[PDB]
Amino acid sequence: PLVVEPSYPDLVINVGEVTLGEENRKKLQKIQRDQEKERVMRAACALLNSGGGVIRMAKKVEHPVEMGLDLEQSLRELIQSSDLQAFFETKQQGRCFYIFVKSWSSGPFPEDRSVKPRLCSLSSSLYRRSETSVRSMDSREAFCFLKTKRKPDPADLIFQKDYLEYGEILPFPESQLVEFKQFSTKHFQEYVKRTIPEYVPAFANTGGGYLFIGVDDKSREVLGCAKENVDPDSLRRKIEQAIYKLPCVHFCQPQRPITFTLKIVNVLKRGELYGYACMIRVNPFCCAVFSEAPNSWIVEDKYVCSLTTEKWVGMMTDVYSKKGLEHKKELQQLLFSVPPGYLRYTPESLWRDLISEHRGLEELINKQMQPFFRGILIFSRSWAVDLNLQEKPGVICDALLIAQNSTPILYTILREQDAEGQDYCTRTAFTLKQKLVNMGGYTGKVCVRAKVLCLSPVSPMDYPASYSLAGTQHMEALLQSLVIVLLGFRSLLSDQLGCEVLNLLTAQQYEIFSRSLRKNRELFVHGLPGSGKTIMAMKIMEKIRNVFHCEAHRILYVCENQPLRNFISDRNICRAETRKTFLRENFEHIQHIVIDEAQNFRTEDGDWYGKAKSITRRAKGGPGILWIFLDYFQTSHLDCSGLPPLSDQYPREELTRIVRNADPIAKYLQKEMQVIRSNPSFNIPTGCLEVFPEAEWSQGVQGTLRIKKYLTVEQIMTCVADTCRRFFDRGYSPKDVAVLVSTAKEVEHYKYELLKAMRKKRVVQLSDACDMLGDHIVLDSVRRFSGLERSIVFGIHPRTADPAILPNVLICLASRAKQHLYIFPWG
Amino acid sequence: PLVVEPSYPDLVINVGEVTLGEENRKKLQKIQRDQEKERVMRAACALLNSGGGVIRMAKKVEHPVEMGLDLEQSLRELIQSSDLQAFFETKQQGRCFYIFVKSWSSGPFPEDRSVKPRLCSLSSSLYRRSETSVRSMDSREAFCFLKTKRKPDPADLIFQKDYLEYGEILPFPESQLVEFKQFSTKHFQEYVKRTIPEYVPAFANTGGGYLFIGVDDKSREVLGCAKENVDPDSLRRKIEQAIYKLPCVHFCQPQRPITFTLKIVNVLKRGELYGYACMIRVNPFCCAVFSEAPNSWIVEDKYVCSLTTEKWVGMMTDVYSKKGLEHKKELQQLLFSVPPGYLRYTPESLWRDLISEHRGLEELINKQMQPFFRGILIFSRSWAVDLNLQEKPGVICDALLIAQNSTPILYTILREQDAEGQDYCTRTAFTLKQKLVNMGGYTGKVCVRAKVLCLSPVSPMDYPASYSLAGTQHMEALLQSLVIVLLGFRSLLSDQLGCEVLNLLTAQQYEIFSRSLRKNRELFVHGLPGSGKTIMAMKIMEKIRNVFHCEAHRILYVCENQPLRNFISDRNICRAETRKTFLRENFEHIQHIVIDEAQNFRTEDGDWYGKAKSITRRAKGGPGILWIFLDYFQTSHLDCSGLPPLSDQYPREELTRIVRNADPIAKYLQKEMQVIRSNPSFNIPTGCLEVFPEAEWSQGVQGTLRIKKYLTVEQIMTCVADTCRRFFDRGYSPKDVAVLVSTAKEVEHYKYELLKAMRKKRVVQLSDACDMLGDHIVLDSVRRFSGLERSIVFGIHPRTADPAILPNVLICLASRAKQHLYIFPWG
Ligand SMILES: [Mg+2]
Ligand SMILES: [Mg+2]
Ligand SMILES: [Zn+2]
Ligand SMILES: [Zn+2]
């Protein structure tokens, strides 16, 4: 059989000695020539169906030869096109001849799913009657036929006769429904055994028909066979055995077998019996009938294996990120934009960390990157772990190079020379290349080279020039498949792409929401947890100054909490003040007002709503903009907020799509929101919590959620400290992490005890929520962190004075986390 | 040549005498066989590209015969599939053999428009190099190739040599870029003539290449040709002319010819000159190169004609209603709903008129329709006029039968028998069948039979059974293609289908607009003329009743004009009253208030806006719905309306898409709306008229708009009577017509005057604007018709006391017409 050889970062199949050249292949016998051709075509079909590769064959001569006309024509039949260069390219060196095969279909969701078949075959074994002939369906014809089947006569008079006269003339000719076959007595049982599999499936696949055996084709004479050789009882058994042996695949209930009527009639000569005539009526079949298993091949594990009939039909009729496929062009420009003129190293934070730890690493990389003047060099502490492979001790970092006028190269950097290092780098380069096609949907010609570098001071296959990245179009198309591949795994770059997907979902919802500015002057925005309520408020104030041409100091932002005030005030889009500041000072110059977390406001210090209404209505442009953002699920107290009654809060906009938290976090939010509806707080209005999320809305972003309980406070700190160190080793920055506790008075206690464990991790710098621009882990209370968000959030000991508000802190805490949430409840 | 036979309701081509049967065709000489096959495939390709038809051929035999393996294979190559039954079906009676051909691609906008090619060809004349061979692209390959071209070496070392030794071995073999031709002196000039169109277009179409002439293929020896026979200057000219003769098609600029380098070199034997060798380097071409004109055929008028190279490329790369195609299933189910169990005659209104005017027509139609038990019989006074053909005097009516277990039949009824009757029906049945395919996009097998019936007391082909209508699915699909065909013509059923497209457009805009009910309690709707403002107001009251679960009498509709008030009351969706009635009577029982035509309201009777707010705010469910509909383009007076200032009219909704008027009416409104912007009325606030229609919005419904000026009052009424008589004769109803005058005081004058001219047209009854349910023509003033609408409107002398309000009168008049508007301005 054929075996893929594992000394290469690709699928390489050795077919052995092959005769090449047309004059050399002519001199061969038909048997040997056909065996060689079939071996080469099995290898080519396997590589077409398995994501591409190289066919290695040994030629018997030194001088360059052509491949041969029969091999060319078989490849043309294999891809159903004369454009043989699009999928095949040939190289030869001395005694070895290479065919580089490109993948037929790429990705789980190709752009041609309903157009082109997913598989190539040597034969589909699907035949149909085509007027007076039987033709096998090619891959496209078989694809259309199975698509059709999956969707939810003068000849009968002769068939009704009980006997036939010898030499009788049949009035009808051969047609779409009639086939005449002459029955020879020397091999009659063998002849009928091979006639059945080729004409019965053809009739059943198209409208049925009549098969007459014993009728001369040219003269239409009924002759039959010798009476002494044919046994009508024995002949019947052979025919029915062959008909029921034909493989059948059903797309329907019931699954009744093939239906036919077989009649053996006597052929009478001069009134005396001369022999028997075999007549078969084949009824049309509900589904596809195969004469045998399809001749399609695929590579699975280390062997070249043939697809079974049921598996072949499955692929011919039929983590993957839909968001990654949709936004792949936007995502690539954000993270993997290729700069013209120089080579870019990403991630830059990880690159600085690596060169600081390892002396001479920067010179090793820089000396290697001299030939390449444009592209990107993507670093990772282990690209194997990023692709769900095994971590190798001794590997410093893995770098993937995507540069112009070069093939992709995977660099594995070792601290010391290792024998198994080459196998580790080849296995990772193989996995990456296969993911780029079968997962990233790359439809071009791709190869990833495996190179090992050592810090301490098998031959490489030569691919055609079409495998080198020619320019920006090739590099961008390849990097857009890496975006899709990365988003299906858990890694730093996967998390950096996941954050940007959440930013694109928010930007999509904002454009729908931003259309309300023209239609409204006063608006109440009832946005669900995780719906981007604060992000929309920031973007609206950017649109207000653009649309109304007012200055930034003419727009006022009012919020309850100081950390959220500081975050907004640092953006320089408006003036940001606290409710207590709002009631005290005078804001007569303000034209537009945006109020956020208004459900957290309090009446004890004055009527803030009347003042906000008064300022905007007396403004120059009639009633100025007064938009009030609130979330009744995140109420922080049982006091009266000062908002108008729920029936007076009109007009309304509702943000029901969760677009700021990953899929595990979002599902936790909907679960906890259902608990609130089952027991709403008394201060909250009765029907406001009846706002439900979208019926079926998903983010398409991977996330993390673990709930760890019954741990002591000291054990809690060690779990937080160990988790952060693992995050920071892979390249995560400390400014992606927040630690949120129940109350602000416990912030000082937990800060000391966390710093006690975190000092062992070379991290002794912690900040509160009032500072979010520094590169430090923020530790503060859940309520004081309102409106802010971090990628990684640790929830430690949720608590409140009244258990009625207790389910709120879980919603308030979980909505602060974008991708990773760790909860440590009381026990 | 091949000529279309004109006596049939289909494209019929007679190819004459053809030998059929495999044994009969094998006995023929090759030239005769190929000529007959080529004639048959010319006919088949023409019918495939021209909407389908029948190939008529006379066979040299009486008994039934098969068609022949070469003919079968040629048809399979023509359609690129072994499914020969889907496009070709054969019949024979006596000495005639019929091939029934289905259309390859149907409709201007096929579903596979971006997938499958539009044309079938016997050859594309597009060759490309496929490794060491030249292969022609079939229709799918050429389609993809032209799509790709549309978007925006060791052999070089030998090429640099100036002289070559006789018998020198070339190191490289034949490949994708290298071809060797052996050059014989007997036909050396003739050989060059043929080799250039074969290999140069193949190289130019795929990446260029090298063509060496004078090198043996098998041994790669440089031989050249005899020095005595070759003229190197003459030989160079011959090659240059042949390359420039190749037809080229450009999808770009510039359009330079084929770039190549031709080199003639000397062949030296034993140090002595032996002859010359020709080496040609072909650069890749920017676009498609043809070896000759494509072999594709089409039917134009009564001839079978071949497409030119530029016309073939145009079809392969590249009144029709967009709205009709998208709504074809809903439009079909509205008008042409097929009933199970009985045969339906449509239209009922036209059918009653026909049987009353003509004695014995009812029994004549019922006698013919007895074999048909399920289907629809579509009547018209002249189906030829509907399809832009000339009317025939003496034709009572035409009917199109679409029934189960039958082919479509077009019946023409004559009052006396006529020789030209059968020619008139056949030309209409031919035109209808070609429209159903080429315009309505029917992808099935269709034939329209032409039958002529006489009221006063060539042979049709027997089509295959696959041309009959088997059941509901075949009948519905054909009726959906008739909807698309009818909407592209001017006829009764076109206007009934055009009105329903307007109702579907209005229902689409309401679904967008009805989402504001959950968000707003008080809302101001600023709709444009023709935006469906009164239609939305009625539909909202249905949703108010359903959403708020209040009964109908709790909803109040307030308008300014009595005729609009009675229109709303007749639908029983609310309580509907006028402004004066609203201010007088008590409405404490009212919860929700909808106000329409609010710009026409007046202040002197009281403060209606405050009363509306008071009633709605004091409702049980807090603030009730208070929606106010208004358009400042239909402002009928210059007084104060009582509306709050434009700055206080928030929240605001705008209906900017025109969905109630046909395209000629819609375009007139936009032009007239532009005049109002340049001269706003003083009573309208400054920023009101700045509402602009949708950037690019079209109705996709065709209509009529004519201006007839300088006519006298007596002349005007005769034209109205003549136009109304023409509409009613064609089957329109009087309730589709309104005659609108400038002032209500002149209504009594024009009513008597019109009745004087209209009595000759056999109706002596007119109805007022307050009565819309009667089947009578409505005559009143423009102002009293506000909020109402008719299909046909005659506008007579638009006039007002102030020329400032005059330009609105054209808007208030034109927007009342859905499809047909006739204006008679002052002279
Ligand atoms: Mg046969
Ligand atoms: Mg050759
Ligand atoms: Zn089945
Ligand atoms: Zn060009």
Author numbering:
A (entry chain B), B (entry chain A): 7 to 158, 188 to 353, 381 to 519, 530 to 899
Provide the authors' original text about this structure.
Schlafen 11 (SLFN11) is an interferon-inducible antiviral restriction factor with tRNA endoribonuclease and DNA binding functions. It is recruited to stalled replication forks in response to replication stress and inhibits replication of certain viruses such as the human immunodeficiency virus 1 (HIV-1) by modulating the tRNA pool. SLFN11 forms a homodimer with the helicase domains adopting an autoinhibited conformation.
The SLFN11 dimer exhibits a ring-like structure with the individual protomers interacting via two interfaces. Interface II is located between the Slfn core domains that interact in a head-to-tail orientation and is formed by mostly polar and charged residues (E78, Q79, R82, S88, R134, T138, S139, R141, E147). In the apoenzyme structure additional density for a metal ion appears at the proposed nuclease active site which is coordinated by residues E209 and E214. We structurally overlaid the helicase domains of SLFN11 and DNA2, another SF I DNA/RNA helicase in its ADP-bound state.
